[PDB]
Design a binder for this molecule. Structure first.
Ligand SMILES: Nc1nc2c(ncn2[C@@H]2O[C@H](COP(=O)(O)OP(=O)(O)OP(=O)(O)O)[C@@H](O)[C@H]2O)c(=O)[nH]1
Ligand SMILES: Nc1nc2c(ncn2[C@@H]2O[C@H](COP(=O)(O)OP(=O)(O)OP(=O)(O)O)[C@@H](O)[C@H]2O)c(=O)[nH]1
Ligand SMILES: Nc1nc2c(ncn2[C@@H]2O[C@H](COP(=O)(O)OP(=O)(O)O)[C@@H](O)[C@H]2O)c(=O)[nH]1
Lengths: 77, 53, 431, 430, 50, 430
């Protein structure tokens, strides 16, 4: 189970989290948080599930996330 | 890079609270230290070989 | 004169057991002070099955309460029927298990298990003849599941031949209470497969669905679900306590229900569960009770029987009825739904009749079905356990309580093997 | 039996402790003199020979003014005189001053009194450290005390309710500096760290309470209500009892990821009260609203890892189950793939008591939602450049160096926070 | 596949029964290792008596 | 179970909604404070645990005066304070101002409150949007809100009770401009749009109510009675129940053609009351009279496509069928060849309640006729040349351009209204 599932998934998590440069992460989170700050300061209120997804689209942050594929499992067999 | 894996990093509070987790953290530190030695060792120079005709 | 040792484990198990003892005392006419006030000879005829006679006329339940935190059994003692139990039967720790099966089975259950087994042995040795033990608890919790599995293993070692009955509240499919429920359930199922001889699977969400669709309740607290479970727990053993036209003890039910020993998980149901509104509009007939009994909504288990195949099914009726009526009704059900019943078993019905119905109901019927449908429940628990276990989230606590990480692989493998048994005996062909 | 030791370090710690202990006294009926006219106070109070109840709290500060305010105020006869510990010189917003030079004797006396308090407890659920990340007393002395407690006490669960600097508005200049230092300190010493931001609480007061002029007393009242809702299950019985030790087991997927957003609901004044249904589903939705969060951090940016709900009042398991099912089905709230449940619901039969003179209304239902989410790395990204921007010029670095710190210590703290950023990205990732 | 499933369940049920026999053997072995020290002590007393 | 969300955009919408909610409170017995001394109110109000009933309404305006009039008036404790939404700068009769520059944040908050209101409704029959076509607030902001509602809610039946500029009399100058803009905007979003004209309602008040000085209050009271008659089938049971979803299928022949004339009967003062029999046939004839139309549009010019009649009070199906048969046999009333039935009759056992201080008399029978007819294209013909006469010189175009308009938008609106004229002529012709 370790080698087939957990070792594979952790190896694919690495070389992706490792590949992501810390400066790029800081800049990405900064653009996101400054967009949220700007919409908070300009607009009277901020609502979830109500956004215009034009001036501020928070879900882009979730889009810019590491995705890892799947292989096979021995325990479930 | 080579950051310690998330599921395996025991904070000092957790290590103090749970001794087996502290032992596991020490074991993982020992393993990571050991991993460097094999790489540093020059794996070349195979054994002398006797052929015959 | 065939005694049963009741054990309650965890908060959910303790609450359900308290409700069950309240129901049993109501059936036997025992007031919360222990004196008999039932005005019926049959009630005192077999009162020794659940109770022992005290120094006076008081009757003390043969119940043992376990916990790692004192608050739950403090509430139980403050409850309406908290004073019947013997104080020596209340075994508690001081720090509750943080929904950690490892804490409830290895670290904090280890010290209390000695006292638990001491009280269990004291209660068992007093019994002239022992049918077995019944443990009421909830899968998906720390102290409940952990101490339940540990005590079940200990009692299995001590009394291999005695019956072991379990009422496990499996974590619900859709809405889950705690995060580590799949972990706890996966660890508990491995022990329950090996040790417990006979097991009932219950779901909070299945109970909610039945209480809104049949009972049509508005604000069902946990007490109502506990009441339904208590009704099932009484009806499963009413044959031991009351004379029956065709009686059947726990071992008879197990023999007629369990085709292969590892396939001992059963879904239960109680009939007639009728809404307050339709009490007059419904008519109490054996065909009515059978129709409600075989409905998918009547199962207290989330898995619907329709997807799987019924390996076996027992029906314990209570009340003055015609055995011809019961047998014809259940044979008709089998013929009508033969596709849903296993072919290589000519009769999938174990019908038993008791002559004493529960109070208020002219007649009742409890259903215990071993069907391959629970395969999907175990599959869902695996789909959650694998999702967490692939990243080892929440795993470091269990690793730190002194259980090896290989034990999780063991438990998941065993549960998946059980899933394989259910599927292959679902798709097995005769000849 | 369920005792919890409360520590309040720094001005902010002591001022939120004033509100917290006022709230507990009002909840348990304890008069400010010390005594009340079963045993539900044992979690916070120990009763003495006269029947007087003394809180198991310790007010630590290097500045005498804040503590003397308590010594003179209405709660002068309640707290223990030696429990109020006062220094001579303030930390002056210097982490080095509060952790290296002045804080030594004060923290030694603090451990002495903490040992005396712990010897008065049969059991000990853990510690509740209330300080202010962003000041020398709060950061340095609090970090030192956390280190000492981790060394000696060991397995006691230490919950740090830290108040972090607001993103844009702030009152200190070296606040990023000592905040990063204290964050590095408590990343390994606290068990569950709760983030609080004054800007977010100000926004909550401005919108939900309609207070155009919020102040520290208002902020501390909301914080006290949050903490009391957190601990309510220890002191009062209810369906789905929740525990201090199981906060971790249900909340901390990995030990590093133990920083937690907090959100209270409802936050409504008396005039707006009894005007809406305030049902369980609505208050849960409000608790998951971004505005209700007490930290200036959009939850939509990250993905929730775990959410522990503490309900107070007339809440039924059906209502909590249906509300959480609706939240899960909701598309905006996004959870990680590796935590399918990610929810820990716990109800209490005791509704939240209302402090007279406050703005919060008497609501029969209340929710305290404490969430471990990867979005919180975003405020850490803010502080991480607020730090390094000044650290490039080494501004105010001589002030910290003078009291026995090194450039290596700042570098190590900033590097540890960068490692925490990497950790947040990895755990958010699949 | 039909033949494979048939042989699978035969083999598995036989293995399960073997495991059950092993557990029963463990139980009897413990139950009589309980008795054996009494025999040893009686032997010691017997020897001392001669 | 039959909840309908009421929206009031612009001054005219809010002022007619004042009368609407006064009428609803008087009909249901709900005192203006909020609570009343079964479940017939659920269509318009949600009741709280304390017993206070709050209307499911939203008062939207960019001007503070109209909303503050409600906030100070008698209905200050009834409506939800956050439901009353007030802007800062008025739209200045500019569609671009109300739809593109000022209206964005206001409509965002409006959708938020609309979502909150709809989440409190088990069922949702639809929306009742009340605005005034011909003003920047009503036209632009209303169009934006309708577009957003169509995008998110989707198939919910939106009934736009629009007040269109009168043929000759008017109070604005750019009213044809923003009327054309709003008509183009709402041609594709609202499901049933009801036309109302101030000139026609003034004539109704003058001839029938004998009011030589009609005012906005009387106009709004008449509109409120019409809407209450329309919605009476949702709240009160009776023979031939009529539903909001039934309105569209029984009234809208083609998706483009969804504008409706409205006419109430009887409109008689108390002095002239009880001086005629007011039988079902007579009131039906009065409702079908061209003078009774609330739009300055002679029905004799066009042909009726559908006529939905709502009867309130003591009306029997025999009487209604005799009246409608007489109407059909009448030569003056002309229906299209392809709609032989053309009638949607409904009765209700609840007579229309009389507002104290109003001019309407307590009549035991009432008819609300809502008709889809091709004659309504006449008003579109009027506004189409009122538009182009100004547009040839591009008068007042720079004002709209200043808030982000182009000549292309005006051209598109004009072309779409010409297409609407063409569709009216096409459906009218055999
Ligand atoms: N929310 C909240 N924050 C507070 C309150 N009082 C102080 N703070 C915060 O606490 C920070 C400084 O606290 P302290 O470090 O304890 O100040 P001090 O007591 O003089 O100690 P030093 O500044 O370290 O010398 C400030 O940045 C404030 O933002 C309060 O009442 N409520
Ligand atoms: N039926 C009716 N119509 C009204 C009433 N009051 C105003 N109107 C009409 O409403 C039109 C304009 O409404 P609004 O756009 O809301 O006026 P506003 O609130 O100042 O907003 P802007 O004019 O766009 O800045 C006018 O042309 C009037 O004809 C009223 O009380 N009843
Ligand atoms: N039917 C029923 N279920 C309960 C009750 N209380 C808790 N549960 C459920 O039981 C599950 C397991 O909790 P449990 O094992 O008792 O927690 P523990 O005692 O700390 O181990 C939880 O997910 C609850 O949803 C109750 O009174 N009745």
């Amino acid at each position: 189970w370790s080698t087939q599932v957990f070792d594979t998934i952790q190896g694919r998590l690495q070389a992706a989290v490792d590949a992501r440069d810390p400066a790029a992460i800081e800049s990405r989170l900064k653009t996101q948080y400054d967009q949220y700050l700007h919409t908070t300061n300009t607009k009277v209120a901020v609502f979830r599930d109500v956004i215009i997804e034009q001036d501020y689209n928070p879900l882009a942050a979730a889009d810019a996330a590491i995705r890892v594929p799947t292989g096979d499992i021995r325990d479930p067999l | 890079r080579s950051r310690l894996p998330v599921h395996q990093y025991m904070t000092t509070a957790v290590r103090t609270r749970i001794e087996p987790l502290n032992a596991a953290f020490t074991a993982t530190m020992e393993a990571r230290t050991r991993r460097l030695a094999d790489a540093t060792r020059p794996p070349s120079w195979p054994e002398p070989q006797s052929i015959s005709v | 004169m065939r005694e049963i040792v009741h054990i309650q484990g965890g908060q959910c198990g303790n609450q359900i057991g308290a409700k069950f003892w309240e129901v049993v005392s109501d059936e036997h006419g025992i007031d919360p002070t222990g004196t008999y006030h039932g005005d019926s000879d049959l009630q005192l005829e077999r009162i020794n099955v659940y109770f022992n006679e005290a120094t006076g006329g008081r009757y003390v339940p043969r119940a043992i309460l376990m916990d790692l935190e004192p608050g739950t059994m403090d509430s139980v003692r403050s409850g309406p029927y908290g004073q019947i139990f013997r104080p020596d039967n209340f075994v508690f720790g001081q720090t509750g298990a943080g929904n950690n099966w490892a804490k409830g089975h290895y670290t904090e259950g280890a010290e209390l298990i000695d006292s638990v087994l001491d009280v269990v042995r004291k209660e068992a040795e007093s019994c002239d003849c022992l049918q077995g033990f019944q443990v009421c608890h909830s899968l998906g919790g720390g102290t409940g599941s952990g101490m339940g599995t540990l005590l079940i293993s200990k009692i299995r070692e001590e009394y291999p031949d005695r019956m072991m009955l379990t009422f496990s509240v499996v974590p619900s499919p859709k809405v889950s209470d705690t995060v580590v429920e799949p972990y706890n359930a996966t660890l508990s199922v491995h022990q329950l497969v090996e040790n417990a001889d006979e097991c009932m699977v219950l779901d909070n969400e299945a109970l909610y669905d039945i209480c809104f669709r049949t009972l049509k309740l508005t604000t069902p607290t946990f007490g109502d679900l506990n009441h339904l479970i208590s009704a099932v727990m009484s009806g499963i053993t009413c044959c031991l306590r009351f004379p029956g036209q065709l009686n059947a003890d726990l071992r008879k039910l197990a023999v007629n229900l369990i085709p292969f020993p590892r396939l001992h998980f059963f879904m239960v149901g109680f009939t007639p569960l009728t809404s307050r509104g339709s009490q007059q509009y419904r008519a109490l007939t054996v065909p009515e009770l059978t129709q409600q009994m075989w409905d998918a909504k009547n199962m207290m288990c989330a898995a619907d029987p329709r997807h799987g195949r019924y390996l076996t099914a027992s029906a314990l009726f209570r009340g003055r009825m015609s055995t011809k009526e019961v047998d014809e009704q259940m044979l008709n059900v089998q013929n009508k739904n033969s596709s849903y019943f296993v072919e290589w078993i000519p009769n999938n019905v174990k019908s038993s009749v008791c002559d004493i119905p529960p109070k208020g109901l002219k007649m009742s019927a409890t259903f215990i079905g071993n069907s391959t449908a629970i395969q999907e429940m175990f599959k869902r628990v695996s789909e959650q356990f694998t999702a967490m276990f692939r990243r080892k989230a929440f795993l470091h606590w269990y690793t730190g309580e002194g259980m090896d990480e290989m034990e999780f692989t063991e438990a998941e493998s065993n549960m998946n093997d059980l899933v394989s048994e259910y599927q292959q005996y679902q798709d097995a062909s005769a000849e | 039996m369920r005792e919890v030791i409360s520590i309040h370090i720094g001005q902010a710690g002591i001022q939120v402790g004033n509100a917290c202990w006022e709230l507990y006294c009002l909840e348990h009926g304890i008069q400010p003199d010390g005594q009340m006219p079963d045993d539900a106070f044992n979690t916070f109070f120990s009763e003495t020979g006269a029947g007087k109840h003394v809180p198991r709290c310790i007010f630590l500060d290097l500045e005498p003014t804040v503590v003397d305010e308590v010594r003179t105020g209405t709660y002068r006869q309640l707290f223990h005189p030696e429990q109020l510990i006062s220094g001579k010189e303030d930390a002056a917003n210097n982490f080095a001053r509060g952790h290296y030079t002045i804080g030594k004797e004060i923290v030694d006396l603090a451990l002495d009194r903490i040992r005396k308090l712990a010897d008065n407890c049969t059991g000990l659920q853990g510690f509740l450290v209330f300080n202010a990340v962003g000041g020398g007393t709060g950061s340095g002395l609090g970090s030192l005390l956390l280190e000492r407690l981790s060394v000696d006490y060991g397995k006691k669960s230490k919950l740090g309710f830290t108040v972090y600097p607001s993103p844009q508005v702030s009152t200190a200049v070296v606040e990023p500096y000592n905040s990063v230092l204290s964050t590095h300190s408590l990343l390994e010493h606290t068990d569950v760290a709760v983030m609080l931001d004054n800007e977010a609480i100000y926004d909550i007061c401005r919108r939900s309470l309609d207070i155009e002029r919020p102040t520290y007393t208002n902020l501390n009242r909301l914080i006290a209500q949050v903490i009391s809702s957190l601990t309510a299950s220890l002191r009062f019985d209810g369906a789905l009892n929740v525990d201090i030790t199981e906060f971790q087991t249900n909340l901390v997927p990995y030990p590093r990821i133990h920083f937690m957003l907090s959100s209270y609901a409802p936050i409504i004044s008396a005039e707006k009260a009894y005007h809406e249904q305030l049902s369980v589903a609505e208050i849960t939705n409000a608790a998951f609203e971004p505005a209700s969060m007490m930290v200036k951090c959009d939850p939509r940016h990250g993905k929730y890892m775990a959410c522990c709900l503490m309900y107070r009042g007339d809440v039924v398991p059906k209502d909590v189950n249906a509300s959480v099912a609706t939240i899960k089905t909701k598309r905006t709230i996004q959870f990680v793939d590796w935590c399918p449940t990610g929810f820990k619901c716990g109800i209490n039969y005791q509704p939240p008591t209302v402090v007279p003179g406050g703005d919060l209304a008497k609501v029969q239902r209340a929710v305290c939602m404490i969430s471990n989410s990867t979005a919180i790395g975003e405020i850490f990204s803010r502080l991480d450049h607020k730090f390094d921007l000044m650290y490039a010029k080494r501004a105010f670095v001589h002030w910290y160096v003078g009291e026995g710190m090194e450039e290596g210590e700042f570098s190590e703290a900033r590097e540890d926070l960068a490692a925490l950023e990497k950790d947040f990205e990895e755990v958010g990732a699949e | 596949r039909k033949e494979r499933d048939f042989h699978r369940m035969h083999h598995k049920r036989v293995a399960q029964e073997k495991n059950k026999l092993l557990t029963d053997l463990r139980r009897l072995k413990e139950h009589y290792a309980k008795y054996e020290p009494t025999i040893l002590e009686l032997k010691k007393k017997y020897e001392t008596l001669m």
